[PDB]
Amino acid sequence: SDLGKKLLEAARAGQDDEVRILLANGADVNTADETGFTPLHLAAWEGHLGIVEVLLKNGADVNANDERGHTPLHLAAYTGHLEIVEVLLKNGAGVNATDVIGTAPLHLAAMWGHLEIVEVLLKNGAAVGAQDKFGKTPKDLARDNGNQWIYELLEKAEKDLRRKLLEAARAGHREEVEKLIKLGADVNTADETGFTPLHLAAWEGHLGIVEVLLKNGADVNANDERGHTPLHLAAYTGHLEIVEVLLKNGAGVNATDVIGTAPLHLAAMWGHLEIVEVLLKNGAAVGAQDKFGKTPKDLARDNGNQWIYELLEKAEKDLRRKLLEAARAGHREEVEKLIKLGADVNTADETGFTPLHLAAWEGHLGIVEVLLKNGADVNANDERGHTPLHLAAYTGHLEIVEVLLKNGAGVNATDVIGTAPLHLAAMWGHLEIVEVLLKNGADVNAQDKFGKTPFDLAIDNGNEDIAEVLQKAA
């Protein structure tokens, strides 16, 4: 619009009567130049109050944005035209509008020292905590630029939001909380002992506030000065719903304070059955001990929470059963985790088979290595007196024999019948394994219950090759 082009220049120039003529003619009040500036942008950037008010009466978009997100309120605050600021807000300007850099009007007012404008912007709900791409707040800009009066004004406002926020989270003022967050309050501020608004909201049982704080980016796993997370406090005080929300939002179900106390310790200690079930269902480890060696089960037993003791006792039994089943099936992932939850690595079934036994019998070298480094007894015996090395030689798992011996497997161990690993290897014709056993110092003269030697068993089973080797070894 050529007519709108002259109106833009008429606003930059400041000719009220010329503008009035152009408004009665009908030239678009929201004309825009190449950048995106409208007649109301320039009336505010130059400081023509009367013109501004007149454009507002003809419905100039109070929140028009140029190609970089600058509104008329940005420009008025930049240049320091207080009368235009107050007017623009009277027409519903966005007090917290930000450009593509995240700069708000309060950034500009604070930087250039327009105290009166700063006071007004705050009176209309400006967020003191807003940060730009450089991470600067209006307080930091004032400070860095030497506006001590303004810096102290904003430093005092931030100090008040942190205090009022914490007091609201601890008091249950869901509305007051949501308000203070809009005003820039640091959602992750911490009191003298490190408690955040989330700690307090969980400690006091304000589910609503816990939901708001999380939606706004609160650290769900925030630690006080001693390692207590909000999940700790929710379990301590016993707020099922909060415990659920936190876990849904990524809470550390096994987080431990400086005393090794986890949330499960506290639920069991203070008899919060429902929360105990939620924590176990979400991966809580039953084997965790505090600095006194007490597990969650010890604390329920010591504190008289029997039904909770039963559940934890069952959970322990279930993990040691699943570990045996995982070791057999060949599920390294299931094994590794079950070991973390607290599954006894040296547990045994009815036969006396341990997870290591099952792993050697089924030929799961991966799972074998996991158990060994986790302290699995290499020379564990079953009712038959079998060692994992026995089962390995029985089945021909070469690599599992090497790893077992590597980790100290009794090479000359004998079962109840006196059978040794070398007997099995020669009996079942595992040439390569016979070479490893003898190379690892295996007894060649060993006799079983029948006086038979590994060579004799190589004869009876008719493995010439292994026979010639045992014959050469002797």
Author numbering: 12 to 485
What do the authors say?
In this paper, we present a strategy to fuse specific, high-affinity protein binders to obtain multivalent or multispecific scaffolds of predetermined geometry. DARPins are used as building blocks to confer the desired specificity to the construct. A series of rigid connector modules replacing the DARPin capping repeats allow to combine the individual DARPin domains in such a way that their distance and angle can be altered to test different geometries, bringing the binding partners of the DARPins into a defined spatial arrangement. The two helices are not just joined end-to-end, but instead the two domains are made to overlap in such a way that the joining helix is stabilized by contacts with the domain cores along its entire length.
D12_H12_D12_H12_D12 crystallized under several different conditions; three structures were determined in space groups P212121, P21, and P3221 at resolutions between 2.4 Å and 2.6 Å. The structure of D12_H12_D12_H12_D12 was determined in three different space groups (P212121, P21, and P3221), which gives an estimate of the impact of crystal lattice forces on the shape of the molecule. Rmsds between chemically identical D12_H12_D12_H12_D12 constructs vary between 1.6 and 2.9 Å. A comparison of three structures of the same construct (D12_H12_D12_H12_D12), determined in different crystal lattices, shows that differences between the structures (rmsds up to 3 Å) are caused by crystal lattice forces. The deviations between different crystal forms are of the same magnitude as the deviations between structures and model. The structures of these DDD fusions are very extended in one direction (>110 Å from N- to C-terminus), and thus amplify the effects of small deviations in the inter-domain angles, making the agreement with the designs even more remarkable. The rmsd for the comparison between design and crystal structure of DDD constructs with H06, H12 and H15 ranges from 1.5 to 4.2 Å. Considering the elongated shape of the DDD molecules, which amplifies the effect of small deviations in the connector, they agree remarkably well with the designs.
